[PDB]
Nucleic acid binder design. Structure first.
Lengths: 55, 91, 95, 80, 106, 90, 82
DNA sequence: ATCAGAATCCCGGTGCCGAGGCCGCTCAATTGGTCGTAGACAGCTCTAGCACCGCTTAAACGCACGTACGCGCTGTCCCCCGCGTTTTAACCG
DNA sequence: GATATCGATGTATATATCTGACACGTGCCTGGAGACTAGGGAGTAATCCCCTTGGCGGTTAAAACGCGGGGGACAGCGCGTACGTGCGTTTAAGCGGTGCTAGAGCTGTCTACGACCAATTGAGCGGCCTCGGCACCGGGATTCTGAT
């Protein structure tokens, strides 16, 4: 799964960031392996629309 | 606040450390001596501690920021951290 | 094995030694029994973890003292270790 | 002194620039610093005890891994 | 009669109860033996602390009965006890009898 | 005005507001739906209903705490999601 | 009917306990998600608790198995058994 | 909606120091016999497991009137963001 | 309109009474104390070595102050609205119990098996030879956004 995500990420070799993305991709892996994170953690774009200044 | 979200994305891609040798080193060294003097810390271990600390900081600050979105627009407060910590159970 | 072992009776004995008039309720009795059994299993697991990790194929006094130190806060465990070391030395010396 | 200044203001600002927080405050830095001392002191104390049981007085990678596994929220360090 | 270790050690808590585990559970070939008395003493002193805290908590409400509500109140008045069981919540906890200014009238 | 009376009354009493028979029946149905022909203890059902009650009252205390934090009393689903995400179980 | 009792679990009780918790008003979109995630949580709890009991070749779910399953889940509660 | 600006995303060249990999060895992995020992299956004691019942009604569900507040707009000031410049120190060696 | 009776019907005011729950003892049961024999494991310390702190220089991106500045928590008001509170309906929750029966837990029996012991041998990592993407500095494509 990390290799498929890395190929999607346009990189030939595995890095911990790709491992983080692979872990966060599956919801069951977030359920079970959510107690452990790996260096420079990441998450899907769950940003809202209230951070930007309103007009 | 609008370029800040762009900087959020930039630091999201970043995958390297920040303060390993000269700083955090002096920190853990100091605390170590405080408990028991004449202690040392493996370089790989130092890196692992810094990454664990920064990852936990990222998660907890993200939690506090989403709690601060409930207080309207964008502004953090001490009570945000305190409340969140209590809710989770850290406090 | 057929006799349903309970651990709240030992707490009851200490209570009767201190304040035999007052006592606990049935649900509360279940709560303290579950607490005692949980702490019992946690210290057993702590001993197992320490024994596995340090290749510690034994567990006399230092191992369980370290388990007590890990389980409990620093100051309270340190005082408990002090009286425990005194007690075990006295017990060995007395016979 | 330099114990509280080990981590600078823009360092926490970078940790907020990668940790969601878009608006920060002076007191927030101090709170996060104190939380960091609590966390670091807990881990270092656990490591001190574990490296005192085996009479070594220095932590290895595996020592750090076991010390952080005791906190419940386990982590996977380098080496092993 | 039969010289058991309870009277010799001066401890009401069961001694070889742990020895049961060590023997039948076959944990290791070198496990426990001295562990019983140690953990028994630690459990006794922790139970004494918890009993004192519960007794202090009960008397605050001019009542002399023990309920797990009062256990939750005593635990939640302790920050260290909270950090010990932060991922735990005891049933019937409710809220405290002291009411904040947010709910009371002007 | 009756909110004060209700708060005092609910502080004086502690009866389990979730009933044992509907939750027992729900547990039996769901368990037999997953794995058929298994028995369930009454004590286990009582413990599970206590666990669910404690979980929901803790979650709702957190929700109230977040509400009064944002100078409000009524709450939106976002707060519940917030609490679950900080707890990390979601 | 001894099936399809997802609607069986009642929201008024959660509302009354929230009132006991201080809450003076709730919403309609809340229970829509609350009930779903409560059902998901109950499904997971029942699944792991009945998985726990299966070891000892038993057919009935015992109290200590449920308590230790919640303990492994990190959302433990103490009761009569355990 | 639409053009210009700052930051960002991917790529190129270089330092290197920790990664990619060869060889021994030695302490561990495997195979083979014993057999008392401890797990799997039939049976004793009996407890509570699945489902429903007499009777009363507390409470869940559905519905009516309206108020505290949900959500949005407006005033403020103070209190932290944007940027130029200096030092200063983090990672390098 | 007043003075002096009759009663009457909530309103306490106790007074037994009997019932769920807590607190003590009791028959008995099963597992630890004593104890000897026999196997191993960490306390203590020496020894190779390595590796992480201290330190000198550098040098260029980051910390931090000065100045400009604008925007958003707080407070209050206003349109709406949705449950707050209560009334009508219904329906099984609960107290206490039963019909049918399954297995909790243990007991007995039975039969595959892993510590122990010994010979054979090989996989992982230390040591060490060789090398290549992380990190930093710089440029082209991508994304978001200010101002209009």
């Amino acid at each position: 799964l990390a290799g498929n995500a890395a190929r999607d990420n346009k990189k030939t070799r595995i890095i911990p960031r790709h491992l983080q993305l692979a872990v966060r991709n599956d919801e069951e892996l977030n359920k079970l392996l959510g107690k452990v994170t790996i260096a420079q953690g990441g998450v899907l774009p769950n940003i809202q629309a209230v951070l930007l200044p309103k007009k | 606040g609008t370029v800040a979200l762009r900087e959020i994305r930039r630091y999201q891609k970043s995958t390297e450390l920040l303060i390993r040798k000269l700083p955090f080193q002096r920190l853990v060294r100091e605390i170590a001596q405080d408990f028991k003097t004449d202690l040392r810390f493996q370089s790989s271990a130092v890196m692992a501690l810094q990454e664990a600390s920064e990852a936990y900081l990222v998660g907890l600050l993200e939690d506090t920021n989403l709690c601060a979105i409930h207080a309207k627009r964008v502004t953090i407060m001490p009570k945000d951290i305190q409340l969140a910590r209590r809710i989770r159970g850290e406090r | 094995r057929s006799r349903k072992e309970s651990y709240s009776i030992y707490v009851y004995k200490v209570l009767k030694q201190v304040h035999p008039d007052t006592g606990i309720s049935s649900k509360a009795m279940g709560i303290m029994n579950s607490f005692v059994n949980d702490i019992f299993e946690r210290i057993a697991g702590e001993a197992s973890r320490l024994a596995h990790y340090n290749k510690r194929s034994t567990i006399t006094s230092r191992e369980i003292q370290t388990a007590v130190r890990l389980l409990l806060p620093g100051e309270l465990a340190k005082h408990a270790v002090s009286e425990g070391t005194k007690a075990v030395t006295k017990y060995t010396s007395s016979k | 002194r330099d114990n509280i200044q080990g981590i600078t203001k823009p360092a926490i600002r970078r940790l907020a620039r990668r940790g969601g927080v878009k608006r920060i405050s002076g007191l927030i830095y101090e709170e996060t610093r104190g939380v960091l001392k609590v966390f670091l002191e807990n881990v270092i104390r656990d490591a001190v005890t574990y490296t005192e049981h085996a009479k070594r007085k220095t932590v290895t990678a595996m020592d750090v891994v076991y010390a952080l596994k005791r906190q419940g929220r386990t982590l996977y360090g380098f080496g092993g | 009669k039969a010289k058991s270790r309870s009277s010799r050690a001066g401890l009401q808590f069961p001694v070889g109860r742990v020895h049961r585990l060590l023997r039948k559970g076959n944990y290791a070939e070198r496990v426990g033996a001295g562990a019983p008395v140690y953990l028994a003493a630690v459990l006794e002193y922790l139970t004494a602390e918890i009993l004192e805290l519960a007794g202090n908590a009960a008397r605050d409400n001019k009542k002399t009965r023990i309920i797990p509500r009062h256990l939750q109140l005593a635990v939640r008045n302790d920050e260290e006890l909270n950090k010990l069981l932060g991922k735990v919540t005891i049933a019937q906890g409710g809220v405290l009898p002291n009411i904040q200014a947010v709910l009371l009238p002007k």
